[PDB]
Amino acid sequence: AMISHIGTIDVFVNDQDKAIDFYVNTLGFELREDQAFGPMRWVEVAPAGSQTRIVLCTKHFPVYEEGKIGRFTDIQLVTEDIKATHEELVRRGVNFTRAPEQMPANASFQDPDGNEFLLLQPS
Amino acid sequence: AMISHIGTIDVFVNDQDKAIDFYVNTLGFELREDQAFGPMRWVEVAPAGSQTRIVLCTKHFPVYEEGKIGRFTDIQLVTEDIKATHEELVRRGVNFTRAPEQMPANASFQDPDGNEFLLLQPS
């Protein structure tokens, strides 16, 4: 096909080192990229083994607009065991805005800058 | 790992039938889901064979805010042949805001509601 897949989605953060620590060491993502391309730093994190990656962008990327840090991301993350994931992320200090519920099971949580993700255990 | 992968990312459109026609029949995506769950309609499209899907959402989804239709999506789509993809999408009437260039090769285009995507042929 012409278009292979979604390669990346941007998430905007206040500081890339702090964000790397959260996404890798608190959420368990992998660090896919961290490369200095001049004045700026290209940083990608993704769930282990997954195809699409998150680019951790700052206020100095041209694609930034005010309001893009600390918003609902419209991203839904998948877990095979939302009970276990929710408990462990709670122990690690992650703020859930909505606990797992068997309706849409899904939950929602935020990173330290307030970026909000849906978390889903699929049928 | 706790988190498996990014399951979905929302894109907001003015009309889901019109959008399905564009994403499936103009961009060549697959229709992954189209199911009526009461008053609303859950619609997913994705590049063929790809893991993460796009949810085509409307102004009546609770996750909508004004400004979410017709914006830069922060999504980068991957193609193995950006010359051929750009030509064919141009023939099909897709508006490119930026033509392919060998710098970040990448291009940018919009859907009919003005939602803007980056298009990338990777190294």
Nearest Cα residue in chain B from A73 = B9
| H/E run at residue B74 | strand B72-78
Give yes or no for a contact between A47 and B5, defined as CB atoms under 8 angstroms apart.
yes
If you measure CA to CA, which chain A residue comes closest to B61? A74
- Specify the CATH number for the domain of residue B98: 3.10.180.10
Structure tokens at A98: 């909505």
Please name the residue of chain A whose CA is at the shortest distance from the CA of residue B3.
A79
Neighbour-count burial of B66, counting CB atoms closer than 10 A to its CB (0-12 exposed, 13-18 middle, 19+ buried): exposed
With CA atoms as reference, report the closest residue to A72 among A38, A44, A110, A20. A110
Domains contained in chain A, number: 1
- For chain B, say whether A82 makes contact (Cβ under 8 Å): no
CA atoms within 13 A on the CB side of A30: 14
* Runs of H (alpha helix) within B1-123: 16-20, 82-91
Nearest to B112 by CA among B10, B20, B5, B8: B20
DSSP code of A69? B
Given strand B72-78, what is the order of strands in its sheet? A30-37, A40-46, A53-57, A5-12, B72-78, B116-120, B106-110, B95-101
Query: Could you tell me the CA-to-CA distances from B71 to A57, B53, B54, B65 in Å, in that order?
Result: 17, 18, 15, 12
Burial A38-66 (b: 16+ CB within 10 A, else e): eeebbbbbbbeebbbbbbbbbeebeeeee
Of A2, A78, A120, the CB nearest to B28: A2
Contact B52 A5 (CB under 8 A): yes
Q: Tell me if residue A61 falls in helix, strand or coil.
A: coil
- As given in the structure block, the two tokens for residue A95 are 């703020």
Q: Domain range for residue B51?
A: 1-123
The rounded distance, in Å, linking the Cα atoms of B119 and B77 is 5
Neighbours of B7 (CB within 10 A): 23
Which residues make Cβ contacts (< 8 Å) with residue A5, sequence separation at least 6? A51, A52, B47, B49, B50, B51, B52, B77, B78
Resolution of the entry in angstroms: 1.8
| CA distance linking residue A87 with residue B62, whole number of Å | 26
Nearest to A10 among B74, B78, B81 (CB): B74
What was the experiment behind these coordinates? X-ray
Nearest alpha-carbon partner for A9 in A67, A70, A65, A76: A76
Secondary structure class of B91 (helix, strand, coil): helix
CB neighbourhood size of B62 (10 A): 7
Distances (CA, A) of A17 to A20, A110, B29, B97: 5, 17, 36, 32
Interatomic CA distance for residues B67 and A53, integer angstroms: 25
For residue A26, which amino acid is it?
A: T
- Taking the CA of residue A18 and the nearest CA in chain B, the distance in Å comes to 20
Whether residue B10 lies within 8 A of chain A, CB to CB, comes out as yes
Distance CA B115, CA A98 (A): 29
State the Cα–Cα distance between residues B71 and B36, nearest whole angstrom.
26
The phi, psi pair for A59, rounded to 5°, reads -65, -15
B12 in Cβ contact with B57 (< 8 Å): yes
Under a CB-based contact definition with an 8 Å cutoff, are residues A99 and A116 in contact? no
d(C-alpha B69, C-alpha B11), whole Å? 8
Position B17, amino acid: D
